[PDB]
mmCIF file of all heavy atoms in Angstrom:
data_model
loop_
_atom_site.group_PDB
_atom_site.id
_atom_site.type_symbol
_atom_site.label_atom_id
_atom_site.label_comp_id
_atom_site.label_asym_id
_atom_site.label_seq_id
_atom_site.Cartn_x
_atom_site.Cartn_y
_atom_site.Cartn_z
ATOM 1 N N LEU A 1 -52.811 39.336 -81.543
ATOM 2 C CA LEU A 1 -52.431 37.972 -81.307
ATOM 3 C C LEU A 1 -52.507 37.667 -79.820
ATOM 4 O O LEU A 1 -52.193 38.541 -79.017
ATOM 5 C CB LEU A 1 -51.015 37.607 -81.794
ATOM 6 C CG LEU A 1 -50.573 37.822 -83.210
ATOM 7 C CD1 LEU A 1 -49.471 36.856 -83.562
ATOM 8 C CD2 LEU A 1 -51.740 37.703 -84.182
ATOM 9 N N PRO A 2 -52.912 36.471 -79.444
ATOM 10 C CA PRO A 2 -53.000 36.124 -78.019
ATOM 11 C C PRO A 2 -51.611 35.926 -77.424
ATOM 12 O O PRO A 2 -50.800 35.208 -77.979
ATOM 13 C CB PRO A 2 -53.803 34.837 -78.015
ATOM 14 C CG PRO A 2 -53.481 34.193 -79.365
ATOM 15 C CD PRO A 2 -53.371 35.345 -80.292
ATOM 16 N N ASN A 3 -51.376 36.547 -76.272
ATOM 17 C CA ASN A 3 -50.264 36.260 -75.408
ATOM 18 C C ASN A 3 -50.775 36.269 -73.968
ATOM 19 O O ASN A 3 -50.301 36.981 -73.063
ATOM 20 C CB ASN A 3 -49.104 37.253 -75.599
ATOM 21 C CG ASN A 3 -47.903 36.989 -74.680
ATOM 22 O OD1 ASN A 3 -47.466 35.843 -74.556
ATOM 23 N ND2 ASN A 3 -47.413 38.034 -74.047
ATOM 24 N N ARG A 4 -51.791 35.437 -73.721
ATOM 25 C CA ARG A 4 -52.662 35.594 -72.566
ATOM 26 C C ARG A 4 -51.915 35.217 -71.273
ATOM 27 O O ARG A 4 -51.225 34.172 -71.229
ATOM 28 C CB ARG A 4 -53.938 34.811 -72.774
ATOM 29 C CG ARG A 4 -54.694 35.291 -74.040
ATOM 30 C CD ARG A 4 -56.045 34.589 -74.316
ATOM 31 N NE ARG A 4 -55.872 33.163 -74.489
ATOM 32 C CZ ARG A 4 -56.089 32.260 -73.541
ATOM 33 N NH1 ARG A 4 -56.590 32.609 -72.359
ATOM 34 N NH2 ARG A 4 -55.792 30.979 -73.771
ATOM 35 N N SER A 5 -52.031 36.064 -70.262
ATOM 36 C CA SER A 5 -51.445 35.735 -68.948
ATOM 37 C C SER A 5 -51.960 34.389 -68.478
ATOM 38 O O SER A 5 -53.108 33.981 -68.777
ATOM 39 C CB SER A 5 -51.805 36.796 -67.912
ATOM 40 O OG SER A 5 -51.476 38.095 -68.338
ATOM 41 N N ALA A 6 -51.116 33.717 -67.702
ATOM 42 C CA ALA A 6 -51.294 32.306 -67.339
ATOM 43 C C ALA A 6 -50.296 32.011 -66.252
ATOM 44 O O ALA A 6 -49.430 32.785 -65.944
ATOM 45 C CB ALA A 6 -51.087 31.406 -68.576
ATOM 46 N N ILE A 7 -50.470 30.800 -65.650
ATOM 47 C CA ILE A 7 -49.547 30.307 -64.626
ATOM 48 C C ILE A 7 -49.082 28.919 -65.039
ATOM 49 O O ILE A 7 -49.800 28.225 -65.796
ATOM 50 C CB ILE A 7 -50.225 30.292 -63.255
ATOM 51 C CG1 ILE A 7 -51.421 29.311 -63.250
ATOM 52 C CG2 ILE A 7 -50.665 31.630 -62.865
ATOM 53 C CD1 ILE A 7 -52.173 29.124 -61.862
ATOM 54 N N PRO A 8 -47.899 28.475 -64.608
ATOM 55 C CA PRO A 8 -47.480 27.136 -64.978
ATOM 56 C C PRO A 8 -47.975 26.111 -64.007
ATOM 57 O O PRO A 8 -47.322 25.795 -62.991
ATOM 58 C CB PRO A 8 -45.933 27.259 -65.010
ATOM 59 C CG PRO A 8 -45.663 28.304 -63.980
ATOM 60 C CD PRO A 8 -46.845 29.238 -63.907
ATOM 61 N N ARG A 9 -49.145 25.532 -64.302
ATOM 62 C CA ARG A 9 -49.978 24.786 -63.352
ATOM 63 C C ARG A 9 -49.229 23.645 -62.695
ATOM 64 O O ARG A 9 -49.507 23.305 -61.532
ATOM 65 C CB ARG A 9 -51.203 24.216 -64.075
ATOM 66 C CG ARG A 9 -52.377 25.162 -64.146
ATOM 67 C CD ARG A 9 -53.575 24.445 -64.784
ATOM 68 N NE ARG A 9 -53.214 23.666 -65.961
ATOM 69 C CZ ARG A 9 -53.338 22.354 -66.033
ATOM 70 N NH1 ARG A 9 -53.769 21.625 -65.009
ATOM 71 N NH2 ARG A 9 -52.962 21.731 -67.151
ATOM 72 N N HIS A 10 -48.293 23.019 -63.414
ATOM 73 C CA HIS A 10 -47.635 21.825 -62.893
ATOM 74 C C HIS A 10 -46.382 22.171 -62.079
ATOM 75 O O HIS A 10 -45.644 21.243 -61.715
ATOM 76 C CB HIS A 10 -47.309 20.897 -64.066
ATOM 77 C CG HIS A 10 -48.545 20.524 -64.841
ATOM 78 N ND1 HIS A 10 -49.666 20.032 -64.249
ATOM 79 C CD2 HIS A 10 -48.802 20.566 -66.165
ATOM 80 C CE1 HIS A 10 -50.578 19.795 -65.151
ATOM 81 N NE2 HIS A 10 -50.091 20.108 -66.352
ATOM 82 N N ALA A 11 -46.119 23.432 -61.801
ATOM 83 C CA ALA A 11 -44.986 23.780 -60.991
ATOM 84 C C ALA A 11 -45.121 23.141 -59.612
ATOM 85 O O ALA A 11 -46.226 23.193 -59.005
ATOM 86 C CB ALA A 11 -44.849 25.298 -60.864
ATOM 87 N N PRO A 12 -44.065 22.571 -59.038
ATOM 88 C CA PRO A 12 -44.119 22.059 -57.680
ATOM 89 C C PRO A 12 -44.717 22.986 -56.628
ATOM 90 O O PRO A 12 -45.364 22.515 -55.694
ATOM 91 C CB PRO A 12 -42.664 21.738 -57.360
ATOM 92 C CG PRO A 12 -42.104 21.312 -58.688
ATOM 93 C CD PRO A 12 -42.837 22.156 -59.737
ATOM 94 N N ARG A 13 -44.542 24.303 -56.774
ATOM 95 C CA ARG A 13 -45.117 25.216 -55.783
ATOM 96 C C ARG A 13 -46.638 25.114 -55.739
ATOM 97 O O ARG A 13 -47.238 25.391 -54.694
ATOM 98 C CB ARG A 13 -44.714 26.685 -56.063
ATOM 99 C CG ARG A 13 -44.946 27.174 -57.484
ATOM 100 C CD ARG A 13 -44.179 28.536 -57.677
ATOM 101 N NE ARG A 13 -44.665 29.333 -58.779
ATOM 102 C CZ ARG A 13 -44.098 29.322 -59.956
ATOM 103 N NH1 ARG A 13 -43.092 28.512 -60.243
ATOM 104 N NH2 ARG A 13 -44.597 30.107 -60.922
ATOM 105 N N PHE A 14 -47.258 24.730 -56.803
ATOM 106 C CA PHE A 14 -48.734 24.758 -56.907
ATOM 107 C C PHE A 14 -49.383 23.502 -56.355
ATOM 108 O O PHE A 14 -50.591 23.335 -56.528
ATOM 109 C CB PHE A 14 -49.153 25.037 -58.345
ATOM 110 C CG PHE A 14 -48.904 26.425 -58.796
ATOM 111 C CD1 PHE A 14 -48.341 26.691 -60.023
ATOM 112 C CD2 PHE A 14 -49.218 27.503 -57.947
ATOM 113 C CE1 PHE A 14 -48.076 28.012 -60.416
ATOM 114 C CE2 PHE A 14 -48.972 28.795 -58.332
ATOM 115 C CZ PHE A 14 -48.411 29.059 -59.570
ATOM 116 N N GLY A 15 -48.635 22.637 -55.705
ATOM 117 C CA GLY A 15 -49.189 21.344 -55.269
ATOM 118 C C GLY A 15 -50.182 21.499 -54.129
ATOM 119 O O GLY A 15 -50.143 22.456 -53.354
ATOM 120 N N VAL A 16 -51.081 20.527 -54.067
ATOM 121 C CA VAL A 16 -52.044 20.440 -52.945
ATOM 122 C C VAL A 16 -51.299 19.961 -51.695
ATOM 123 O O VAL A 16 -50.470 19.041 -51.733
ATOM 124 C CB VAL A 16 -53.182 19.481 -53.307
ATOM 125 C CG1 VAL A 16 -54.029 19.151 -52.062
ATOM 126 C CG2 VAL A 16 -54.076 20.142 -54.359
ATOM 127 N N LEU A 17 -51.590 20.592 -50.549
ATOM 128 C CA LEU A 17 -50.857 20.317 -49.337
ATOM 129 C C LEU A 17 -51.731 19.494 -48.405
ATOM 130 O O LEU A 17 -52.915 19.782 -48.224
ATOM 131 C CB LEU A 17 -50.454 21.619 -48.647
ATOM 132 C CG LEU A 17 -49.624 22.574 -49.484
ATOM 133 C CD1 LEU A 17 -49.687 23.963 -48.925
ATOM 134 C CD2 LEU A 17 -48.205 22.075 -49.567
ATOM 135 N N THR A 18 -51.138 18.444 -47.835
ATOM 136 C CA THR A 18 -51.789 17.721 -46.750
ATOM 137 C C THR A 18 -52.249 18.698 -45.650
ATOM 138 O O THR A 18 -51.805 19.853 -45.612
ATOM 139 C CB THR A 18 -50.810 16.700 -46.141
ATOM 140 O OG1 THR A 18 -49.816 17.385 -45.395
ATOM 141 C CG2 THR A 18 -50.167 15.850 -47.262
ATOM 142 N N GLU A 19 -53.160 18.275 -44.790
ATOM 143 C CA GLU A 19 -53.553 19.137 -43.696
ATOM 144 C C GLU A 19 -52.360 19.421 -42.765
ATOM 145 O O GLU A 19 -52.229 20.522 -42.241
ATOM 146 C CB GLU A 19 -54.726 18.581 -42.940
ATOM 147 C CG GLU A 19 -54.946 19.342 -41.659
ATOM 148 C CD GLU A 19 -56.202 18.908 -40.938
ATOM 149 O OE1 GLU A 19 -57.297 19.169 -41.487
ATOM 150 O OE2 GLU A 19 -56.035 18.351 -39.838
ATOM 151 N N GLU A 20 -51.500 18.418 -42.594
ATOM 152 C CA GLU A 20 -50.350 18.561 -41.739
ATOM 153 C C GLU A 20 -49.457 19.733 -42.195
ATOM 154 O O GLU A 20 -49.216 20.666 -41.436
ATOM 155 C CB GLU A 20 -49.547 17.244 -41.691
ATOM 156 C CG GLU A 20 -48.880 17.005 -40.379
ATOM 157 C CD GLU A 20 -48.182 15.644 -40.346
ATOM 158 O OE1 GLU A 20 -47.375 15.370 -41.227
ATOM 159 O OE2 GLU A 20 -48.509 14.888 -39.402
ATOM 160 N N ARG A 21 -48.981 19.672 -43.429
ATOM 161 C CA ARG A 21 -48.089 20.717 -43.939
ATOM 162 C C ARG A 21 -48.749 22.085 -43.908
ATOM 163 O O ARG A 21 -48.067 23.117 -43.716
ATOM 164 C CB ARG A 21 -47.591 20.355 -45.327
ATOM 165 C CG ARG A 21 -46.237 20.897 -45.667
ATOM 166 C CD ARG A 21 -45.480 19.920 -46.543
ATOM 167 N NE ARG A 21 -46.391 19.264 -47.485
ATOM 168 C CZ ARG A 21 -46.253 19.344 -48.827
ATOM 169 N NH1 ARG A 21 -45.287 19.996 -49.396
ATOM 170 N NH2 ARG A 21 -47.196 18.697 -49.557
ATOM 171 N N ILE A 22 -50.053 22.155 -44.122
ATOM 172 C CA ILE A 22 -50.794 23.443 -44.049
ATOM 173 C C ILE A 22 -50.662 24.000 -42.645
ATOM 174 O O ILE A 22 -50.226 25.143 -42.456
ATOM 175 C CB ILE A 22 -52.248 23.266 -44.448
ATOM 176 C CG1 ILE A 22 -52.414 22.914 -45.939
ATOM 177 C CG2 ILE A 22 -53.031 24.533 -44.165
ATOM 178 C CD1 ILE A 22 -53.852 22.907 -46.397
ATOM 179 N N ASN A 23 -51.084 23.236 -41.647
ATOM 180 C CA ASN A 23 -51.070 23.735 -40.262
ATOM 181 C C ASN A 23 -49.682 24.129 -39.797
ATOM 182 O O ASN A 23 -49.501 25.122 -39.088
ATOM 183 C CB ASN A 23 -51.684 22.696 -39.341
ATOM 184 C CG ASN A 23 -53.189 22.654 -39.427
ATOM 185 O OD1 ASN A 23 -53.825 23.703 -39.442
ATOM 186 N ND2 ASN A 23 -53.736 21.449 -39.474
ATOM 187 N N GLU A 24 -48.684 23.316 -40.197
ATOM 188 C CA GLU A 24 -47.329 23.587 -39.766
ATOM 189 C C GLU A 24 -46.861 24.918 -40.327
ATOM 190 O O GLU A 24 -46.258 25.749 -39.607
ATOM 191 C CB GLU A 24 -46.439 22.439 -40.273
ATOM 192 C CG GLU A 24 -44.973 22.769 -40.355
ATOM 193 C CD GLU A 24 -44.363 22.167 -41.572
ATOM 194 O OE1 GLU A 24 -44.771 21.024 -41.911
ATOM 195 O OE2 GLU A 24 -43.462 22.787 -42.174
ATOM 196 N N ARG A 25 -47.101 25.168 -41.610
ATOM 197 C CA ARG A 25 -46.583 26.347 -42.261
ATOM 198 C C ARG A 25 -47.199 27.610 -41.749
ATOM 199 O O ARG A 25 -46.563 28.675 -41.692
ATOM 200 C CB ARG A 25 -46.758 26.236 -43.770
ATOM 201 C CG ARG A 25 -45.831 25.228 -44.424
ATOM 202 C CD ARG A 25 -45.993 25.273 -45.919
ATOM 203 N NE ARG A 25 -45.025 24.373 -46.565
ATOM 204 C CZ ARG A 25 -45.031 24.079 -47.885
ATOM 205 N NH1 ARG A 25 -45.880 24.664 -48.681
ATOM 206 N NH2 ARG A 25 -44.114 23.245 -48.358
ATOM 207 N N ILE A 26 -48.492 27.577 -41.355
ATOM 208 C CA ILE A 26 -49.212 28.795 -40.951
ATOM 209 C C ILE A 26 -49.024 29.056 -39.449
ATOM 210 O O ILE A 26 -49.374 30.169 -38.993
ATOM 211 C CB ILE A 26 -50.681 28.700 -41.268
ATOM 212 C CG1 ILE A 26 -51.327 27.478 -40.623
ATOM 213 C CG2 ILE A 26 -50.905 28.711 -42.786
ATOM 214 C CD1 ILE A 26 -52.837 27.388 -40.778
ATOM 215 N N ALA A 27 -48.513 28.120 -38.656
ATOM 216 C CA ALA A 27 -48.360 28.305 -37.228
ATOM 217 C C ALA A 27 -47.309 29.342 -36.899
ATOM 218 O O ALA A 27 -47.276 29.878 -35.763
ATOM 219 C CB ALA A 27 -48.029 26.981 -36.554
ATOM 220 N N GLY A 28 -46.429 29.661 -37.844
ATOM 221 C CA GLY A 28 -45.410 30.651 -37.654
ATOM 222 C C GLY A 28 -45.761 31.995 -38.287
ATOM 223 O O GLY A 28 -44.880 32.705 -38.752
ATOM 224 N N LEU A 29 -47.046 32.316 -38.325
ATOM 225 C CA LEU A 29 -47.519 33.579 -38.914
ATOM 226 C C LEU A 29 -48.316 34.463 -37.974
ATOM 227 O O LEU A 29 -48.588 35.587 -38.333
ATOM 228 C CB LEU A 29 -48.362 33.281 -40.128
ATOM 229 C CG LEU A 29 -47.784 32.365 -41.208
ATOM 230 C CD1 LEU A 29 -48.802 32.124 -42.329
ATOM 231 C CD2 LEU A 29 -46.494 32.949 -41.743
ATOM 232 N N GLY A 30 -48.675 33.965 -36.815
ATOM 233 C CA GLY A 30 -49.330 34.805 -35.818
ATOM 234 C C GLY A 30 -50.835 34.960 -36.005
ATOM 235 O O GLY A 30 -51.369 36.008 -35.674
ATOM 236 N N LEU A 31 -51.468 33.951 -36.501
ATOM 237 C CA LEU A 31 -52.906 34.091 -36.834
ATOM 238 C C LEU A 31 -53.757 33.976 -35.570
ATOM 239 O O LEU A 31 -53.504 33.108 -34.752
ATOM 240 C CB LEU A 31 -53.332 33.090 -37.860
ATOM 241 C CG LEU A 31 -52.544 33.078 -39.178
ATOM 242 C CD1 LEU A 31 -53.049 31.956 -40.052
ATOM 243 C CD2 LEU A 31 -52.698 34.445 -39.853
ATOM 244 N N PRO A 32 -54.805 34.782 -35.473
ATOM 245 C CA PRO A 32 -55.779 34.644 -34.389
ATOM 246 C C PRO A 32 -56.273 33.219 -34.316
ATOM 247 O O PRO A 32 -56.478 32.548 -35.321
ATOM 248 C CB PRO A 32 -56.875 35.616 -34.758
ATOM 249 C CG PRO A 32 -56.247 36.625 -35.664
ATOM 250 C CD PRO A 32 -55.183 35.882 -36.424
ATOM 251 N N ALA A 33 -56.503 32.747 -33.078
ATOM 252 C CA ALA A 33 -56.960 31.367 -32.872
ATOM 253 C C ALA A 33 -58.390 31.173 -33.399
ATOM 254 O O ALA A 33 -58.757 30.076 -33.782
ATOM 255 C CB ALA A 33 -56.863 31.009 -31.404
ATOM 256 N N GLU A 34 -59.220 32.208 -33.370
ATOM 257 C CA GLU A 34 -60.504 32.203 -34.020
ATOM 258 C C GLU A 34 -60.564 33.266 -35.138
ATOM 259 O O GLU A 34 -59.765 34.225 -35.128
ATOM 260 C CB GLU A 34 -61.672 32.459 -33.045
ATOM 261 C CG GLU A 34 -61.814 31.408 -31.916
ATOM 262 C CD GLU A 34 -62.071 32.079 -30.589
ATOM 263 O OE1 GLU A 34 -62.748 33.110 -30.531
ATOM 264 O OE2 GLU A 34 -61.589 31.544 -29.540
ATOM 265 N N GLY A 35 -61.476 33.104 -36.039
ATOM 266 C CA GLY A 35 -61.642 34.031 -37.132
ATOM 267 C C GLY A 35 -61.438 33.422 -38.497
ATOM 268 O O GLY A 35 -60.487 32.671 -38.776
ATOM 269 N N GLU A 36 -62.359 33.781 -39.421
ATOM 270 C CA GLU A 36 -62.227 33.405 -40.812
ATOM 271 C C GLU A 36 -61.325 34.425 -41.510
ATOM 272 O O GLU A 36 -61.447 35.635 -41.259
ATOM 273 C CB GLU A 36 -63.594 33.331 -41.495
ATOM 274 C CG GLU A 36 -64.578 32.434 -40.744
ATOM 275 C CD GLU A 36 -65.981 32.401 -41.371
ATOM 276 O OE1 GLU A 36 -66.689 33.440 -41.293
ATOM 277 O OE2 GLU A 36 -66.373 31.348 -41.938
ATOM 278 N N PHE A 37 -60.415 33.962 -42.351
ATOM 279 C CA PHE A 37 -59.412 34.792 -42.994
ATOM 280 C C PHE A 37 -59.827 35.233 -44.410
ATOM 281 O O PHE A 37 -60.442 34.460 -45.138
ATOM 282 C CB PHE A 37 -58.070 34.071 -43.135
ATOM 283 C CG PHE A 37 -57.487 33.679 -41.818
ATOM 284 C CD1 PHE A 37 -57.146 32.349 -41.599
ATOM 285 C CD2 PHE A 37 -57.325 34.587 -40.819
ATOM 286 C CE1 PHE A 37 -56.609 31.975 -40.357
ATOM 287 C CE2 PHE A 37 -56.787 34.224 -39.582
ATOM 288 C CZ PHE A 37 -56.423 32.917 -39.355
#
């Protein structure tokens, strides 16, 4: 019987982030100023 792994797509955590909120959240992580991640 299927009990297939899945994610709850409509969870608030899964929302699309404005560019603002993206840049803000990652600025406190120490990422190199250049470089693809």
Side-chain angles (χ1 to χ4, degrees):
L1 304 208
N3 179 46
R4 301 183 299 99
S5 307
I7 62 177
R9 273 184 316 115
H10 303 310
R13 51 193 199 264
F14 288 135
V16 167
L17 303 161
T18 72
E19 170 174 292
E20 212 175 56
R21 209 145 37 121
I22 292 186
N23 282 316
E24 161 220 323
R25 287 186 177 173
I26 58 176
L29 307 178
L31 303 176
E34 300 136 33
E36 307 177 290
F37 299 126

